[PDB]
Amino acid sequence: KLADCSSKSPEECEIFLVEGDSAGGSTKSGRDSRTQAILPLRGKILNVEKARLDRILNNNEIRQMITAFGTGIGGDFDLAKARYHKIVIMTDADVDGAHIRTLLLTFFYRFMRPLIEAGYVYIAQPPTGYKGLGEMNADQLWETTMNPEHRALLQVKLEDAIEADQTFEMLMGDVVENRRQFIEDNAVYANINERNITSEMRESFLDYAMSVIVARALPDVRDGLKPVHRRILYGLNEQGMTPDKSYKKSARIVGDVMGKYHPHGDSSIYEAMVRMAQDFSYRYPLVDGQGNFGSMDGDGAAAMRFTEARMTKITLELLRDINKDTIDFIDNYDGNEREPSVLPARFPNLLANGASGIAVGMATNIPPHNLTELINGVLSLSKNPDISIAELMEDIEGPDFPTAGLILGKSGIRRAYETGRGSIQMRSRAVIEERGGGRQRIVVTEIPFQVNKARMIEKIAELVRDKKIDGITDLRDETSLRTGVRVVIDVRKDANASVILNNLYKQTPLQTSFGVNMIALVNGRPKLINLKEALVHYLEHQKTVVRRRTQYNLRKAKDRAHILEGLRIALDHIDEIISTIRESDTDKVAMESLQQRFKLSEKQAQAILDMRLRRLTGLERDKIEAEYNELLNYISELETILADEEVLLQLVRDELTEIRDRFGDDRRTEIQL
Amino acid sequence: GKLADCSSKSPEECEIFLVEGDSAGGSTKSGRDSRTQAILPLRGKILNVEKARLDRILNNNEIRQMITAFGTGIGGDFDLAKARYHKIVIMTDADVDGAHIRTLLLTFFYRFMRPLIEAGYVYIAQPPTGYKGLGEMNADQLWETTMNPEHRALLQVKLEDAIEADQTFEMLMGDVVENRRQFIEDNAVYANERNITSEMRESFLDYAMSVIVARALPDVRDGLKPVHRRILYGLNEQGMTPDKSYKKSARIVGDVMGKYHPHGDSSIYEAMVRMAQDFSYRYPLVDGQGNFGSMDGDGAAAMRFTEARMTKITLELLRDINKDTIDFIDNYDGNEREPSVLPARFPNLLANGASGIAVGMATNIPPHNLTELINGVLSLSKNPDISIAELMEDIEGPDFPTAGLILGKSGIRRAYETGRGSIQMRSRAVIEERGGGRQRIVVTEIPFQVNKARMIEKIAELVRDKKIDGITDLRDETSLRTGVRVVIDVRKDANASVILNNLYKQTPLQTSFGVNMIALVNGRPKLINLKEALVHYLEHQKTVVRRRTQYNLRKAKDRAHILEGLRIALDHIDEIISTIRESDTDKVAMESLQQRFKLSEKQAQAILDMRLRRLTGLERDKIEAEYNELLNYISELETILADEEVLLQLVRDELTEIRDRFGDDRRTEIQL
DNA sequence: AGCCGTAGGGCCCTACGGCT
DNA sequence: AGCCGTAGGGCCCTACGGC
Ligand SMILES: COc1ccc2nccc(CC[C@H]3OC[C@H](NC(=O)c4ccc5c(c4)NC(=O)CO5)CO3)c2c1
Numbered sequence A: 001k002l003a004d005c006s007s008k009s010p011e012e013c014e015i016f017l018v019e020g021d022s023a024g025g026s027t028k029s030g031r032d033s034r035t036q037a038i039l040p041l042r043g044k045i046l047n048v049e050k051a052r053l054d055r056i057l058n059n060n061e062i063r064q065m066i067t068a069f070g071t072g073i074g075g076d077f078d079l080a081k082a083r084y085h086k087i088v089i090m091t092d093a094d095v096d097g098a099h100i101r102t103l104l105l106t107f108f109y110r111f112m113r114p115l116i117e118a119g120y121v122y123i124a125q126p127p128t129g130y131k132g133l134g135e136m137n138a139d140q141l142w143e144t145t146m147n148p149e150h151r152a153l154l155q156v157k158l159e160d161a162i163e164a165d166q167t168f169e170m171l172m173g174d175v176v177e178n179r180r181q182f183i184e185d186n187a188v189y190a191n192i193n194e195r196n197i198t199s200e201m202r203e204s205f206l207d208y209a210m211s212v213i214v215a216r217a218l219p220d221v222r223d224g225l226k227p228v229h230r231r232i233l234y235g236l237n238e239q240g241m242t243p244d245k246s247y248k249k250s251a252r253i254v255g256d257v258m259g260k261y262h263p264h265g266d267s268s269i270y271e272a273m274v275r276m277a278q279d280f281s282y283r284y285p286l287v288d289g290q291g292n293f294g295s296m297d298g299d300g301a302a303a304m305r306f307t308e309a310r311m312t313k314i315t316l317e318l319l320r321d322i323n324k325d326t327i328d329f330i331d332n333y334d335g336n337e338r339e340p341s342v343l344p345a346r347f348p349n350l351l352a353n354g355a356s357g358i359a360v361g362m363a364t365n366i367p368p369h370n371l372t373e374l375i376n377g378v379l380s381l382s383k384n385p386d387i388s389i390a391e392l393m394e395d396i397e398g399p400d401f402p403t404a405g406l407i408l409g410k411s412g413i414r415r416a417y418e419t420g421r422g423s424i425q426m427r428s429r430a431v432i433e434e435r436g437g438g439r440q441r442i443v444v445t446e447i448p449f450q451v452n453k454a455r456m457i458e459k460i461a462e463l464v465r466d467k468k469i470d471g472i473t474d475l476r477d478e479t480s481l482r483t484g485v486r487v488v489i490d491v492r493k494d495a496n497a498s499v500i501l502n503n504l505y506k507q508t509p510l511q512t513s514f515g516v517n518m519i520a521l522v523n524g525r526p527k528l529i530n531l532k533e534a535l536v537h538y539l540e541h542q543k544t545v546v547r548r549r550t551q552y553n554l555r556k557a558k559d560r561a562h563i564l565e566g567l568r569i570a571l572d573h574i575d576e577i578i579s580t581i582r583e584s585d586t587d588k589v590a591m592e593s594l595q596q597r598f599k600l601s602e603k604q605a606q607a608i609l610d611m612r613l614r615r616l617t618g619l620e621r622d623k624i625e626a627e628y629n630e631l632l633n634y635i636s637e638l639e640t641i642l643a644d645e646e647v648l649l650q651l652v653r654d655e656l657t658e659i660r661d662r663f664g665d666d667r668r669t670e671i672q673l
Numbered sequence B: 001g002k003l004a005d006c007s008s009k010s011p012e013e014c015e016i017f018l019v020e021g022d023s024a025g026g027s028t029k030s031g032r033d034s035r036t037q038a039i040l041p042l043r044g045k046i047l048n049v050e051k052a053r054l055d056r057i058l059n060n061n062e063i064r065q066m067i068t069a070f071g072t073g074i075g076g077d078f079d080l081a082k083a084r085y086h087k088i089v090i091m092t093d094a095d096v097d098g099a100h101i102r103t104l105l106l107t108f109f110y111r112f113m114r115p116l117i118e119a120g121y122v123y124i125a126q127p128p129t130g131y132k133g134l135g136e137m138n139a140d141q142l143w144e145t146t147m148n149p150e151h152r153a154l155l156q157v158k159l160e161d162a163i164e165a166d167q168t169f170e171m172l173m174g175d176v177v178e179n180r181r182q183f184i185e186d187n188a189v190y191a192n193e194r195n196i197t198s199e200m201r202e203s204f205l206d207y208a209m210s211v212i213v214a215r216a217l218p219d220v221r222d223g224l225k226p227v228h229r230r231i232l233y234g235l236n237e238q239g240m241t242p243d244k245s246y247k248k249s250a251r252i253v254g255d256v257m258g259k260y261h262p263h264g265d266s267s268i269y270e271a272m273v274r275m276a277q278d279f280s281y282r283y284p285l286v287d288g289q290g291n292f293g294s295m296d297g298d299g300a301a302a303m304r305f306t307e308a309r310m311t312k313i314t315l316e317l318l319r320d321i322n323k324d325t326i327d328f329i330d331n332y333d334g335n336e337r338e339p340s341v342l343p344a345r346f347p348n349l350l351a352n353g354a355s356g357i358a359v360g361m362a363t364n365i366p367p368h369n370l371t372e373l374i375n376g377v378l379s380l381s382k383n384p385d386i387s388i389a390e391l392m393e394d395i396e397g398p399d400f401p402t403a404g405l406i407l408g409k410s411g412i413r414r415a416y417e418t419g420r421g422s423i424q425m426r427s428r429a430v431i432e433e434r435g436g437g438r439q440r441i442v443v444t445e446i447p448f449q450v451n452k453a454r455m456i457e458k459i460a461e462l463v464r465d466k467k468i469d470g471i472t473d474l475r476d477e478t479s480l481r482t483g484v485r486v487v488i489d490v491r492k493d494a495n496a497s498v499i500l501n502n503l504y505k506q507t508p509l510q511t512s513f514g515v516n517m518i519a520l521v522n523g524r525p526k527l528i529n530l531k532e533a534l535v536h537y538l539e540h541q542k543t544v545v546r547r548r549t550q551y552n553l554r555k556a557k558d559r560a561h562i563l564e565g566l567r568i569a570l571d572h573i574d575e576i577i578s579t580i581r582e583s584d585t586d587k588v589a590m591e592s593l594q595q596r597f598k599l600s601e602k603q604a605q606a607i608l609d610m611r612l613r614r615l616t617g618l619e620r621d622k623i624e625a626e627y628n629e630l631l632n633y634i635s636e637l638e639t640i641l642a643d644e645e646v647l648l649q650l651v652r653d654e655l656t657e658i659r660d661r662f663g664d665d666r667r668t669e670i671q672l
Numbered sequence C: 001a002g003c004c005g006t007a008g009g010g011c012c013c014t015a016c017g018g019c020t
Numbered sequence D: 001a002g003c004c005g006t007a008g009g010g011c012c013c014t015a016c017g018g019c
């Protein structure tokens, strides 16, 4: 990995740590290879503050850093033996780079403290607006960042130790609550110089943490999506990949999304897209995949060069009226594109499909739900702001998993909908049945959500082999496209099969809990929310969307009647119209002449100058009158909706109801007492 | 291993499907009936056992997995009794690479498991085409077509004459290239049971002709392989021109993968990267931003990091592509159109050169100076009987991006005469003082295609293993600011020149370029000499300029015809408007306009599409200005089409301009 | 040898939080 | 104790021909 310098005189020698060979290459090409060494790492380095020492000392990248510095670790640490008097951290100028920087400072503080004391550690300052240093040309990387003349390094000073120790403990240690508190306390949500090592850690760390929270791992309460899923669906949309049209190569989709909207690795995008295609993961799948999109047995999808994809019908409902000023667009990562900040989301997607995400200081875990039940819930809520969770549960019985199965008891469900937290006990659907000669078997035909069917079956085998469960004489996955899931467990003759089943439910994922933890972005801040808040924020979104959409169609039909007004004047005075144009030299004079003569606006004048001659035929004259008369009718319909809060809300209901009628379906998961 | 066995054991009723990898595997595993159907994914191309020794075969993972899985052992240890399946089913992707992996698999079974074949246990599944690999198929469909024993069509492989079979495996898959080449030349055609010899011959031949005509060899006209052509056409169709800014590498590769080139990402991205390296291409076709590699054989950044567009001179490859200069063809799936060849307004085969390993043959064509090339083609255009020797008054010999030296003219001369020759390339190295009466060797240019770091390591090896006297140190002082610089310290009092000569004998510091000018001519491979290359090249240009002139003619005559309808209309504007105003439909207006004013359908249409702003005052006059300049152009064009000396001179003229704008100095020095 | 350059194909480290 | 899902990062086997 190391690409060393010529000079062995450590006095004048620098080593640069970079994230991988992609940056490595640019760095190598632009360095001064007499004084300047380069060590590429390989992504996130190990967190030494949370890891056992066995594996701190085995980890490659840790090891190689040790070798390169040649000073040994901890007690047996000779400053005098530093092969370099400058260790320069130069990760990418993105948030994951800030995080890899915190990880490294932690390693150095806890294993090479003197190195920091001695003033040998530094932080390079590459320009922003660059995914990694691999996107820079070597000359740029040199001028800006590496050239001893016209560059700016921060030298890491350690002031108070005690404070440093607490900081590393809080930020990087395994007590989440300490970290969570710091985030809350310091996050500001939207509506050779010395650098203190504590200052750097808290600023770098918070930068990462906030970024993961608002812009990675948590879904938005309004549309139920994380950034990656939003930019995927929105890309499908901008490229017209509707279900009527045909499937397009995943690589096209991914390439496009990566380029315009999502400056991150290919596999994060493709894997997100894949899940959205899996009817064992999504209760209402958002992508329609062609090819191998993986199995319940933990199989990956085929590589993105093989598969293809489009929207499902129901994703249309997520995107409807996105170009009717329903929702605010923002700048993409680099200035050159516009992306939606949220989707219209005309059905309640946060709950329908659920969410899961590991952030920093917190996580989220929201189960999926029956859409017929959810919309009935939003209906009841719309007729009654003061409805209770108990009343809402009259409609929303509890979660509805794609994989079906059983939930045991209404009581975890109730806590989760009331507090935002609760454990939910899920079981497989298993029956006991004769197989012949007075012997029996267990048949599992549905397994709990998020359980790998293979791993589950291996577990049972590994219980039968470690002689750790009695009575089982065979185990077979008879699952098949033709017959559905079907896992068979033969039972020894005369053994009690019900007992064996209970044993499996105790000792295998045949029974599994689901720990609800309903954190989402509300005003782009993380909040633990109950069932009713989820539906309130959802309905508040829908109200705004149907209002803005109605306001937009008004401005637009008004703009258009205005033009049809110019054109009807034209048709009534066509001879004089022709005359005015013919007697004009420029287009500028005609425009002025038509405004004055016939009291037309600039826009009308221009639309008349744009009329083609074929529009003076019989049918074309009629269409202009017809389009105009239909449009006045529509304009006054729109005005009705905007002048009356109750007609608007009634529209919201009628629309929800239509979606419930077209996409609603049976409950799959049975909830038992 | 990723073996997914079935649940039954008795092999009489159990089958195993071999597929290319896990993408195919998953569709196969979700599709299959797992009571009787095992699946074993491989990993792409398997080893050719006909060309490998036994130590290597038995180290190979995929080979091992197959042996284990089948349970018969191999060779004389073979045993039909211990078969775990009575049907072994080869199910590779429905493409040419899948024919090839079929031939490799059958080569393994015939040489190590022949009784398996003698006994009827081997089979070939028949998936549908249209799908890159099985990973693009849904499991329901792969079940119906291919795997379900009530529907599928299986071929059962049969051995007849074992002597013929031996000859075939030997010829097709053995180490002797020439019999294979001969079999290709003899069988190629350019523009229930299955005999194993027929399968081998037909599957291999497919593969072979696919690599030859459509992978590894350049076209003589444009100097390009399918992958480079599709990339450049891609850049163009998305206007990624040099005036515009850079697009993202992943977008470009994604575009091209979908539209034109159904193959792995890395083949595309790597082809693009090389086109951007100024140490690889004498005249780079791609302009890249980010890490695109080094002479030390670092690869580019991954494609999420880099951006790219055309270079100035690529516009010249593409100039006039829209003027019917070249025949477009269907892409691989029917939903696109691609160029079969580029206009190529400079001679790109010899300019940037080409190297490719095919089947039965290879190509290796060095790069050249463009100022020289062009003077060459001009000279040829003044004299169809120009000799190689006269041609070499312009074209001194290869000119490499990396500069350096060529020793003597005799390899050059042989190469240009016959299309084969060996050319000795040598570093640019000087000897210089370093202080205290010591000296060093400074190397500042290295041969084409010689990895600099790997070369420095071969020098270290010699010093370490004491096969060279007198070297005390070795350093790469290469930098952006300094250019290539490799220093070799010599021991006080040792003769530096001697040392340097040893380095030339013993290191890539001197390297042969083995010229072997194979290219496609009417899409068939041909060994061509210097002159035959320039001639095909000149022929393409004349065709281009002629087809270009024919196109502008059709187009200017079409436009004149429109303008003759517009003249009539502006001159009769009222009767025109009444004619229309009186007409119920757009149809009736066309008919009336046409009867009353002697107009064609297309003249009537142009009038009906006329906007009212065209009736302003100075428009009857513009139409007339335009129309008179059109008639002038029309005849300027007819001049050209009727006199071949005028067309040829036109060709000469455009080339001279390209020479003036893009021609640069020779970099490689030719020492005699 | 083993390397040139288009082709087939796939695997494994790391962070992060909460549940087992 | 190790999985789940967005994220950071990269490597190594194969065919082909010519020297
Ligand atoms: C399969 O299993 C193995 C296992 C062993 C391996 N050892 C080392 C490295 C790897 C893979 C690392 C490599 O890095 C670059 C990756 N792709 C991109 O950067 C990229 C970005 C955007 C894109 C595309 C690609 N593809 C498009 O068509 C457009 O959108 C491709 O994968 C290995 C792979």
Ligand SMILES: [Mn+2]
Pocket: A019, A092, A096, A097, A131, A132, D008
């Ligand atoms: Mn990075």
Ligand SMILES: [Mn+2]
Pocket: B020, B093, B097, B098, B132, B133, C008
């Ligand atoms: Mn394949």
